[PDB]
Design a protein around this ligand. Structure first.
Ligand code: H50
Ligand code: H50
Lengths: 116, 115, 115, 116
């Protein structure tokens, strides 16, 4: 699992469950090509997005669908989504965890990058 | 001044000075069209991006060029840029401040929407 | 104005208005002695806490009464208060802004220390 | 494990290893009585602070020793520590995770509170 996403809710004090996440990878022509997608579990974690083979060097965008998540809970939030855009694997394969904490009008994200 | 951007630096404990910020509006074909841009001041603020008449309802993206900011300070950064994407809705209050706190592997952003 | 406090609300997307803030200085016996206090303004800011002559080097605690703030809004909060504890050191720049972003189960704080 | 602490470093993109944490509990007389302490592991996590029996109702302060952590890495940070003060177990036993993300001049903390 070289790409994981963990999301917490700062209003409820809970994992953020059933949050949709789409990952895109910048293509040869400079567009955002769909790469992987999935949704957070009961623990707020999203595993199994990709594999070591498929997760090659590139510029990736991890879009966390915070508006969808908040609307589902009956709340009108500010942002459309939270975006995390970064170059990956440019020194060889790393494992990345993108952690996010969500409020209706704010989010924070950080990355944990490990070398297996 | 319906739209202001204010950026802080969590490593130096200072405003984030001379950071490029580009704002885009989402066009009818779902592409992002340039809307306004500038560099943050000594106080980490960017005023004067737009006028009331120009800032209509719509989806906007504020891209903050964090990677060049950290490289100019000799610090190795994780992100290509930071992006804040939101709907401007006239039912809400009328003045939008997008605020961001930058670290090399992290950022936080919040909106302050007032009258 | 060597010391300013600015507080934002991540749930409402607004300044955090009428929040009580107490500042303490650490005494020689390691107890916290009252130093300054006030309530944030409509803009979420608290100016005028102290003067240059009064604000000496030392360890300070800024306690932000978040629990009463969230209860007055009818929201159930996690924390008793938020606390920011730091050393004021004259070798650094001279003006300290403590900024905080509040949520019911979370808060972030950063320092902006400038000349 | 009803009380856990997880700490990330926003400068390195890593767990924050070997971070000291002291927990205090407000006593009958209104002082802060030492309750438990420990340090984060290689994963940035601190387990085994307390037990279900000992972690009773009360007002707790979790002090994360961020100044010590940064000084050990050769960095002069702003804060003495990060403090998380909250009432616990006042509706019966819950499990709490206090998550923190640290920068030299900033920190963020959130709580995840679960009902076993
Ligand atoms: O296993 C992890 O990585 C978990 C975690 C999830 C989120 C956070 C965290 C805590 C604070 C902030 Cl501001 C952000 Cl962006 C992320 C954290 F510190 C830890 C505990 C869920
Ligand atoms: O005028 C404002 O709004 C300023 C400001 C700029 C940024 C922040 C801020 C502080 C903490 C976090 Cl996590 C975030 Cl996203 C933003 C803040 F609280 C305040 C103080 C300069």
């Amino acid at each position: 699992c070289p790409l994981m996403v963990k999301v917490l809710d700062a209003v409820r004090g809970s994992p953020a469950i059933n949050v949709a996440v789409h990952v895109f990878r910048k293509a040869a022509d400079d567009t955002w090509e769909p790469f992987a997608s999935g949704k957070t579990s009961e623990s707020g974690e999203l595993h199994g997005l990709t594999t070591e083979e498929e997760f090659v060097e590139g510029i990736y965008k991890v879009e966390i669908d915070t508006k969808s998540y908040w609307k589902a809970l009956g709340i009108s939030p500010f942002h459309e989504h939270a975006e995390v855009v970064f170059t990956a694997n440019d020194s060889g394969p790393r494992r990345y965890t993108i952690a996010a904490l969500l409020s209706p009008y704010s989010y924070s994200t950080t990355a944990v990058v490990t070398n297996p």
